[PDB]
PDB file of C-alpha atoms in Angstrom:
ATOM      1  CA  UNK A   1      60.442  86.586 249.626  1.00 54.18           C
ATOM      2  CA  UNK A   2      62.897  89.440 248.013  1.00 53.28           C
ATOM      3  CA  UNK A   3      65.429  87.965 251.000  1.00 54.06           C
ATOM      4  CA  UNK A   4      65.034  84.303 249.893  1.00 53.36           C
ATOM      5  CA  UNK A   5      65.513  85.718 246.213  1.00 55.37           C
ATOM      6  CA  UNK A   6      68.958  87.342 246.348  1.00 54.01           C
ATOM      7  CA  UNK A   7      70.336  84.641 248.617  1.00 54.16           C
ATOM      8  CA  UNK A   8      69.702  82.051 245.811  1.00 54.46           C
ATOM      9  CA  UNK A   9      70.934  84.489 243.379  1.00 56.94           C
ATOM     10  CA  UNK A  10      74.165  85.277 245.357  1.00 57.31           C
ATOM     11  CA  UNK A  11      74.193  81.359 246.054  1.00 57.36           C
ATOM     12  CA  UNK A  12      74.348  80.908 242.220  1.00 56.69           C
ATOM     13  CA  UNK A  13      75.443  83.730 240.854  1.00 55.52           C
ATOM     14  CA  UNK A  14      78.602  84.455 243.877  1.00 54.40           C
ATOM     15  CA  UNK A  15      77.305  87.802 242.445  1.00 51.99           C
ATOM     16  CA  UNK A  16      76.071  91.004 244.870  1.00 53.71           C
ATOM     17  CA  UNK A  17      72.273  90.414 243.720  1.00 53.34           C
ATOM     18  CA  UNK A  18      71.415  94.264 244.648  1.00 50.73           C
ATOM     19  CA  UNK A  19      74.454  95.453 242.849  1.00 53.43           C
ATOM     20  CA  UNK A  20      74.114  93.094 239.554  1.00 55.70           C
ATOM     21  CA  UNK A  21      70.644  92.754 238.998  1.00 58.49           C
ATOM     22  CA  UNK A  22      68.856  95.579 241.133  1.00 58.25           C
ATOM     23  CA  UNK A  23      68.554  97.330 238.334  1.00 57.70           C
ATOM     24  CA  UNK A  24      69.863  95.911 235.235  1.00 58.85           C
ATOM     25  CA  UNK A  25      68.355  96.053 231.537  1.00 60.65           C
ATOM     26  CA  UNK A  26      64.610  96.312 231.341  1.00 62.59           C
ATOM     27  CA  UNK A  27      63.543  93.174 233.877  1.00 61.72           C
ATOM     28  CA  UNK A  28      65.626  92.976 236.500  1.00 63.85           C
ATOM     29  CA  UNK A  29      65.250  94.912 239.559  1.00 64.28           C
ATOM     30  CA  UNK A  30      62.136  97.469 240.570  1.00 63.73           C
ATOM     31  CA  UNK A  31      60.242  98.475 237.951  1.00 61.50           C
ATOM     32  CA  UNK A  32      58.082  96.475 235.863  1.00 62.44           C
ATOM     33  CA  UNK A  33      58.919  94.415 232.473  1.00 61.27           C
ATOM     34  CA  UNK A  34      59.906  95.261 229.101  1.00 60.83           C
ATOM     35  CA  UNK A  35      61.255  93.725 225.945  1.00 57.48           C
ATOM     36  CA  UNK A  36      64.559  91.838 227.379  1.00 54.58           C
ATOM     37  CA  UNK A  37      68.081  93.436 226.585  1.00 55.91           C
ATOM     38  CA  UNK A  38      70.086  90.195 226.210  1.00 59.46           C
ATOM     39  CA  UNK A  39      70.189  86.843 228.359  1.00 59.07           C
ATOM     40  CA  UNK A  40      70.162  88.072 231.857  1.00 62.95           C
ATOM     41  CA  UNK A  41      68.052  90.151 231.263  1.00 62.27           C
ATOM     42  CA  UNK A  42      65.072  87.649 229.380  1.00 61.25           C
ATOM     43  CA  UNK A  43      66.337  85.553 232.485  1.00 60.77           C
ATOM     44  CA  UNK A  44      64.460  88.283 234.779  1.00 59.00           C
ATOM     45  CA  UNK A  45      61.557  88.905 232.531  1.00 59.69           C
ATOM     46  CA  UNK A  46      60.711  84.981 232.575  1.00 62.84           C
ATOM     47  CA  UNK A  47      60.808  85.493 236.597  1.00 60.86           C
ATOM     48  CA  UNK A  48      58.575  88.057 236.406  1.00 63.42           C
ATOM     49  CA  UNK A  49      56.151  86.026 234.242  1.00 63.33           C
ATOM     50  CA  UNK A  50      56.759  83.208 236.776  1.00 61.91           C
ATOM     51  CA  UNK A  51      55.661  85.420 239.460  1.00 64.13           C
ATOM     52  CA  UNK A  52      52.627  87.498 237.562  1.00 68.18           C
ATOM     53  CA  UNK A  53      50.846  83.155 237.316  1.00 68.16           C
ATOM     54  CA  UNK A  54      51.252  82.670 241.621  1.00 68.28           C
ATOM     55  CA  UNK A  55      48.660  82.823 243.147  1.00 71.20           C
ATOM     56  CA  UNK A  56      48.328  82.249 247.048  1.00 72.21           C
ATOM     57  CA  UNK A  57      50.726  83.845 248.084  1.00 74.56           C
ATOM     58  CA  UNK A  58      53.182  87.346 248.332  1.00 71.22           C
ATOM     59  CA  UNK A  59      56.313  86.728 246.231  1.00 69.31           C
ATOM     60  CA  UNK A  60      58.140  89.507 247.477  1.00 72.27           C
ATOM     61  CA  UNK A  61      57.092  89.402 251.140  1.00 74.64           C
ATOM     62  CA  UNK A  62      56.144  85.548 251.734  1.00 70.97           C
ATOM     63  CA  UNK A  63      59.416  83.757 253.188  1.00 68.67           C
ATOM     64  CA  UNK A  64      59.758  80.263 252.689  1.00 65.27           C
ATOM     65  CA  UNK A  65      61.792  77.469 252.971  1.00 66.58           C
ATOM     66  CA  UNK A  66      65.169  76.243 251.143  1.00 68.96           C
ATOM     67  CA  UNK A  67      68.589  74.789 251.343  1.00 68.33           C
ATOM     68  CA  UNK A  68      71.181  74.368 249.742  1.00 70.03           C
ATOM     69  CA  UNK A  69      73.076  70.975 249.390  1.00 69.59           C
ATOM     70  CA  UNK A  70      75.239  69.679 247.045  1.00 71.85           C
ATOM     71  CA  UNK A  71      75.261  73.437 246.011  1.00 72.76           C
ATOM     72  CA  UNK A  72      71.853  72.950 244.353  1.00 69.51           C
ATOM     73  CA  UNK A  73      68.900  75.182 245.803  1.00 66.96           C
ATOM     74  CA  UNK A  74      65.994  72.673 246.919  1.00 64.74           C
ATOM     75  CA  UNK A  75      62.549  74.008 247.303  1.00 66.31           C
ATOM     76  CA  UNK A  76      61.165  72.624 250.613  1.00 69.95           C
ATOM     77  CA  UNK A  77      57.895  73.257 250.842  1.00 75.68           C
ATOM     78  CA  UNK A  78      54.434  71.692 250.430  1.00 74.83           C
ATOM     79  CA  UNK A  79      52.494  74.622 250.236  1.00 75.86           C
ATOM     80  CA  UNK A  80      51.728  75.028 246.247  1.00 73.55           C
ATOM     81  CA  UNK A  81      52.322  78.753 246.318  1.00 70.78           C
ATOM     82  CA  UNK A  82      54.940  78.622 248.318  1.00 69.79           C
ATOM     83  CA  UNK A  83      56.689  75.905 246.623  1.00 69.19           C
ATOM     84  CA  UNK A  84      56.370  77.551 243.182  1.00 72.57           C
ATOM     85  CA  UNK A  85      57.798  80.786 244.375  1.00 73.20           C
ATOM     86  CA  UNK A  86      60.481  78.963 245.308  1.00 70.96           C
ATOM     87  CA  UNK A  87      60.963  77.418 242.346  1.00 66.00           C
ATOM     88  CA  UNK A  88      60.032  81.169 240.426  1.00 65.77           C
ATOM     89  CA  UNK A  89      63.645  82.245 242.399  1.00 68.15           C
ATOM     90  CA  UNK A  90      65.745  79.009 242.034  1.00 65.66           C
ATOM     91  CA  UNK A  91      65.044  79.682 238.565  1.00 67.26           C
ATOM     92  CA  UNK A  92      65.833  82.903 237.647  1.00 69.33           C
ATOM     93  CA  UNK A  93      68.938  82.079 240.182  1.00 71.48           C
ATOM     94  CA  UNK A  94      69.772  79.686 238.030  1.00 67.10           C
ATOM     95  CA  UNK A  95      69.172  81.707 234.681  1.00 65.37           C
ATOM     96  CA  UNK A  96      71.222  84.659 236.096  1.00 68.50           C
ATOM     97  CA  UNK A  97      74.139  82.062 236.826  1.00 68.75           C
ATOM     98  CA  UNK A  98      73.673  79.977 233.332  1.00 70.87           C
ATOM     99  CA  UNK A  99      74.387  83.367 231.555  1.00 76.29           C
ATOM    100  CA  UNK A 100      76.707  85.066 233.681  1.00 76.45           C
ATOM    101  CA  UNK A 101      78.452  84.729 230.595  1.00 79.05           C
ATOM    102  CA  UNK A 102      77.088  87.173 228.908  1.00 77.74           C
ATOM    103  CA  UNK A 103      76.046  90.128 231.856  1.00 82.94           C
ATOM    104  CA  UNK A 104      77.033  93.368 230.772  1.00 82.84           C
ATOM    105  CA  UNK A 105      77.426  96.312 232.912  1.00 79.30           C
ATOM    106  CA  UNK A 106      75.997  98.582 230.377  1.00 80.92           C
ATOM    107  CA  UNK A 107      72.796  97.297 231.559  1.00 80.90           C
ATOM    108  CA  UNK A 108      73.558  98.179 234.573  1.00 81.50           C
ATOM    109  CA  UNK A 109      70.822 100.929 235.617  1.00 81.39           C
ATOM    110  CA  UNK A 110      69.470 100.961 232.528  1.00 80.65           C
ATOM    111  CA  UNK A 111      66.899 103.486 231.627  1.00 80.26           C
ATOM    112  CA  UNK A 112      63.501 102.467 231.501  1.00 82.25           C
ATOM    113  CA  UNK A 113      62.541 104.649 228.751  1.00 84.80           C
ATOM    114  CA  UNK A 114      64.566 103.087 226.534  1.00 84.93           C
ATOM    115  CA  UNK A 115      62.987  99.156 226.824  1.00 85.11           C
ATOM    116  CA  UNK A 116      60.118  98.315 224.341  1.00 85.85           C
ATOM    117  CA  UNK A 117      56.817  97.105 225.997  1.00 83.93           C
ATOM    118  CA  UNK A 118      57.114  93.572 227.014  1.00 83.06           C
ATOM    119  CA  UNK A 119      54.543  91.018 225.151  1.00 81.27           C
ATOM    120  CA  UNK A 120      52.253  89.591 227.768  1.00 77.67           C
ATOM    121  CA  UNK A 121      53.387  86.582 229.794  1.00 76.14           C
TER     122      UNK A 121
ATOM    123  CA  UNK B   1      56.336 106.539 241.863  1.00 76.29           C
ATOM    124  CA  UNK B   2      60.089 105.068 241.758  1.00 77.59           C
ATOM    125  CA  UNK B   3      60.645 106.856 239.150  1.00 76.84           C
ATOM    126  CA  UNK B   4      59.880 110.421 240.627  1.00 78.28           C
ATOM    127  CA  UNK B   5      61.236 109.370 243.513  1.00 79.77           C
ATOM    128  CA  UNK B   6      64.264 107.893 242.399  1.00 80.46           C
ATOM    129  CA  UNK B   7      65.018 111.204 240.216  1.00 77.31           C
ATOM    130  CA  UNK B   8      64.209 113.298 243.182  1.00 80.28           C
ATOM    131  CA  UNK B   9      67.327 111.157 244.891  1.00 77.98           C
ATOM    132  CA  UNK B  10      69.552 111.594 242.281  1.00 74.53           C
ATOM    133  CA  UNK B  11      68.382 115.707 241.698  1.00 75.41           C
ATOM    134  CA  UNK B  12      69.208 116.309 245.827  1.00 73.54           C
ATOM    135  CA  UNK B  13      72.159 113.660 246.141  1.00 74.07           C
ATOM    136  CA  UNK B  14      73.978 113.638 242.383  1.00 70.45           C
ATOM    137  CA  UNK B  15      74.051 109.799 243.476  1.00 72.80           C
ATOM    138  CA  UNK B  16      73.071 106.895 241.607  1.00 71.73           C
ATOM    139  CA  UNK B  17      69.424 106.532 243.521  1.00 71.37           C
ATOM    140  CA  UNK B  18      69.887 102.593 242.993  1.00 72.27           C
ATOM    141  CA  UNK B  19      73.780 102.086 243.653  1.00 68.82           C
ATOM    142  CA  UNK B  20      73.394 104.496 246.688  1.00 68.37           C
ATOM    143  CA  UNK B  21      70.050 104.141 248.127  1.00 67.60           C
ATOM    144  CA  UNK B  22      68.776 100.842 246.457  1.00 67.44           C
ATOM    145  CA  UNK B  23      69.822  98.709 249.339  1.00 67.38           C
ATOM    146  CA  UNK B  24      71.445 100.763 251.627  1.00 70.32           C
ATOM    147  CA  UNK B  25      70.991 100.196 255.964  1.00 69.00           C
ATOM    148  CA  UNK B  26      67.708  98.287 257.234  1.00 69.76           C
ATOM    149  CA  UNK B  27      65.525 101.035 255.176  1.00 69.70           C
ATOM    150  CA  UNK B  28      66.014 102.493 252.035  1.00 69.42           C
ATOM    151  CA  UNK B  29      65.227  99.751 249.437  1.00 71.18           C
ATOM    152  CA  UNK B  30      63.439  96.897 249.560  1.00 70.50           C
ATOM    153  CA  UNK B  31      60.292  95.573 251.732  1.00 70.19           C
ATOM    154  CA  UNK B  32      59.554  97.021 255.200  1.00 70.28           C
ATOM    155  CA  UNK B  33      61.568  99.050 257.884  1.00 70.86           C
ATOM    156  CA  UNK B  34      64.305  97.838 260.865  1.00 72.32           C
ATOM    157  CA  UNK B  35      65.835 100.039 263.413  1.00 74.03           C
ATOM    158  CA  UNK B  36      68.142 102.141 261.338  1.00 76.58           C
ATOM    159  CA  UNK B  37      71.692 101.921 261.047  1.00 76.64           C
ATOM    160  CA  UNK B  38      72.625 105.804 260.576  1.00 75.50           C
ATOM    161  CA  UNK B  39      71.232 108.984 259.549  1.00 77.35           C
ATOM    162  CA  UNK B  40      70.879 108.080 256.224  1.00 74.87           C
ATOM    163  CA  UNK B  41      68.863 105.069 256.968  1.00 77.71           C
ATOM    164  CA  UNK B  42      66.755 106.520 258.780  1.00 79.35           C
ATOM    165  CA  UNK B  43      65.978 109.051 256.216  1.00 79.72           C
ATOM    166  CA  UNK B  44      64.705 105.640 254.266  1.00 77.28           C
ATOM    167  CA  UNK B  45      62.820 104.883 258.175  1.00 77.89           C
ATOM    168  CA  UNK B  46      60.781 108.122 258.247  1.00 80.80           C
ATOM    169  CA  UNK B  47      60.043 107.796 254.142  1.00 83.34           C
ATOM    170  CA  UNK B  48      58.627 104.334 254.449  1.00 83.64           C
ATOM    171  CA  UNK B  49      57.016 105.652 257.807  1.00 85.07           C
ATOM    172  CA  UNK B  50      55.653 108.789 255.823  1.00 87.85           C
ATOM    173  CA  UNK B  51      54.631 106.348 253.056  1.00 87.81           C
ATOM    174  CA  UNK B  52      51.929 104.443 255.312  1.00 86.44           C
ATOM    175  CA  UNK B  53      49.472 107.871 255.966  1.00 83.76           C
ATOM    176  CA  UNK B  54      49.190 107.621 252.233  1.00 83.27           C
ATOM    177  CA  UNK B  55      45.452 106.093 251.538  1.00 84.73           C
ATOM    178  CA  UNK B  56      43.921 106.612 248.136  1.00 88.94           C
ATOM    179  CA  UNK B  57      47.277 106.216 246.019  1.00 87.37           C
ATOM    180  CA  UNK B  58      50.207 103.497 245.368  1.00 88.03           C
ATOM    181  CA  UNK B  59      53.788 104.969 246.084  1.00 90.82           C
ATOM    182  CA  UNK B  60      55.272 103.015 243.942  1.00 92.04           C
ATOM    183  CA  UNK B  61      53.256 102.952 240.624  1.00 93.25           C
ATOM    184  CA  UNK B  62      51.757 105.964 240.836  1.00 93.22           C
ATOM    185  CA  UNK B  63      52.958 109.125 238.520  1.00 93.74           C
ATOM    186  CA  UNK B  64      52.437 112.594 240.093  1.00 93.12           C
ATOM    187  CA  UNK B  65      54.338 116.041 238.959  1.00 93.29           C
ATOM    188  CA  UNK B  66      56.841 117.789 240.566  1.00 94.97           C
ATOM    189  CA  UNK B  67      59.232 120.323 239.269  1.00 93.24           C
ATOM    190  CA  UNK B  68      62.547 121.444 239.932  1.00 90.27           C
ATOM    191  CA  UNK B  69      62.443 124.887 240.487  1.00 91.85           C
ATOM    192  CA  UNK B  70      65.584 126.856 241.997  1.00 92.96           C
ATOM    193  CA  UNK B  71      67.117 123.638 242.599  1.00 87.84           C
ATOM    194  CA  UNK B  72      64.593 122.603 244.784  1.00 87.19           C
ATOM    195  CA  UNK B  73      61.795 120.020 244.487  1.00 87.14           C
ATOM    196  CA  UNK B  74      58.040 121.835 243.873  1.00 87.64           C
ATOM    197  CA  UNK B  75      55.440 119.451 244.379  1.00 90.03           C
ATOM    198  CA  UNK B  76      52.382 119.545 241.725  1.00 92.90           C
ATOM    199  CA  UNK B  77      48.749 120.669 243.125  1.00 88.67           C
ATOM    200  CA  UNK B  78      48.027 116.596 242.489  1.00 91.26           C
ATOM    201  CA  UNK B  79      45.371 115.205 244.496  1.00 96.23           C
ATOM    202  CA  UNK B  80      45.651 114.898 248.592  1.00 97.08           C
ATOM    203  CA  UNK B  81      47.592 111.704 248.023  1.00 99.15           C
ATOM    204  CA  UNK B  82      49.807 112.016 245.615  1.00100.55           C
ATOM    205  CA  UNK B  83      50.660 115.258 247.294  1.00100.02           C
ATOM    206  CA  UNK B  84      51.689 113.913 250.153  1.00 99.38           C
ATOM    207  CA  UNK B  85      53.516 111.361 248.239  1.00 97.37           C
ATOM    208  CA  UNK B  86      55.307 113.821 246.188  1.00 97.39           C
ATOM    209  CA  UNK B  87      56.330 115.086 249.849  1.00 99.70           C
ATOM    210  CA  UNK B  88      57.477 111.960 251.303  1.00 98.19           C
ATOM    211  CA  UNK B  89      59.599 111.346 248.340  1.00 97.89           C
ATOM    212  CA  UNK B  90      60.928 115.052 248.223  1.00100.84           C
ATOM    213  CA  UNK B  91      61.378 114.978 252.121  1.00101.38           C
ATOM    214  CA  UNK B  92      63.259 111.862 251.841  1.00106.31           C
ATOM    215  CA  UNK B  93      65.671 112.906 248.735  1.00105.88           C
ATOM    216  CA  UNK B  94      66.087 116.107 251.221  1.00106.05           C
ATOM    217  CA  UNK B  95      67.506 113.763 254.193  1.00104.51           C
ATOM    218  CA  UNK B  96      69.371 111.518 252.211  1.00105.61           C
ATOM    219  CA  UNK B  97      71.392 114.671 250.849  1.00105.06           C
ATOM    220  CA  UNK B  98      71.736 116.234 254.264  1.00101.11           C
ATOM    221  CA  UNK B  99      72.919 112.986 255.406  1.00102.41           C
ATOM    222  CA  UNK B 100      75.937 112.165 252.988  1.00101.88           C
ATOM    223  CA  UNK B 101      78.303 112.848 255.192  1.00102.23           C
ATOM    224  CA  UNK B 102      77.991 110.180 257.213  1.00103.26           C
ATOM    225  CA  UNK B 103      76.906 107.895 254.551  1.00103.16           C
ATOM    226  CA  UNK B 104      78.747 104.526 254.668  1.00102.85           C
ATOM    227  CA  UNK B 105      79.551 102.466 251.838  1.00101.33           C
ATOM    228  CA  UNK B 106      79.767  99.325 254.482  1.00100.04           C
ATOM    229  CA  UNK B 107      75.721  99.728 254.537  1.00102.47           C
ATOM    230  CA  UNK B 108      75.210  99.367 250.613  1.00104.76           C
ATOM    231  CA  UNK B 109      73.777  96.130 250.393  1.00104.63           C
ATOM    232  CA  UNK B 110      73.141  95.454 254.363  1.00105.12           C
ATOM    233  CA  UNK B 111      71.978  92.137 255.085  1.00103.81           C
ATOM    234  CA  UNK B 112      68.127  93.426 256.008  1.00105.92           C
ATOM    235  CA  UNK B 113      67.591  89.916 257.095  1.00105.42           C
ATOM    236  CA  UNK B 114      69.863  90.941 260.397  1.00109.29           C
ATOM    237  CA  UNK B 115      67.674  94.062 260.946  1.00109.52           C
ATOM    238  CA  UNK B 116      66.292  94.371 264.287  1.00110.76           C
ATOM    239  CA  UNK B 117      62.234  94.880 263.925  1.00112.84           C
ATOM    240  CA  UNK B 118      61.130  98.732 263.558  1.00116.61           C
ATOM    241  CA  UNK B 119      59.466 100.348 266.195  1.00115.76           C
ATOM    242  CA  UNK B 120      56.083 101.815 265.788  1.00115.70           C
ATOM    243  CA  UNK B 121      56.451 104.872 262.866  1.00115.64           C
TER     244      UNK B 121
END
């Protein structure tokens, strides 16, 4: 779920998942997809791909299980849908983290209107 | 939609409808409702409340029209539901104004997790 989501994110990132990537270029956050600003950004489109192919199950609303040793998120469930939302979130947590490097603020709240219309998944 | 909804936000508020109200208390963001923290949340409480008599229309994909007119938010004729949409979202940018007085940055972000369970809307 959304909850299991930023926790990984925050677990990764050690960023404030509402505040860096609630809203941020034309992937991340509430609204839909859209050709990706830069890294982070392509980083949420991917996750939206990932979770557009589940089937099963409610990626925002379905919790699930996880942990976190040796500071690595572990997926632990069974249940295929379940189990590949998981792995949809570790993901992107991981993405977001890889190019931290790169964020930009400027992104930040980005205006929708300005993203070109994402290619399908 | 969102998007009407967050610019009604931003037209009452002059906030940042994400920064401010993206994840702010047990109720204005994300997911379902909790037992509000303040006035302002439970501006977000009676919105999501308001947003379950809607039937024949998605609050959060849906278009409809409104227009600012006298600084005030004028609802389009639309049809029954997005009507009533239009008028949860304008009745919720409404509260959330006439609550900033009280609003409290220490809820941005609130761990919803830690929300107790709504009562019945």
């Amino acid at each position: 779920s959304l909850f299991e989501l930023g926790k990984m994110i925050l677990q990764e990132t050690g960023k404030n998942p509402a505040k860096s990537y609630g809203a941020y270029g034309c992937n991340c956050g509430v609204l839909g997809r859209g050709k990706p600003k830069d890294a982070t950004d392509r980083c949420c489109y991917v996750h939206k791909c990932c979770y557009k192919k589940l089937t099963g199950c409610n990626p925002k609303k379905d919790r699930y299980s996880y942990s976190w040793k040796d500071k690595t998120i572990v997926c632990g469930e069974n249940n295929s849908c379940l189990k590949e939302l998981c792995e949809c979130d570790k993901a992107v947590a991981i993405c977001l983290r890889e190019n931290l490097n790169t964020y930009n603020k400027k992104y930040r709240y980005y205006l929708k209107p300005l993203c070109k219309k994402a290619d399908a998944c």
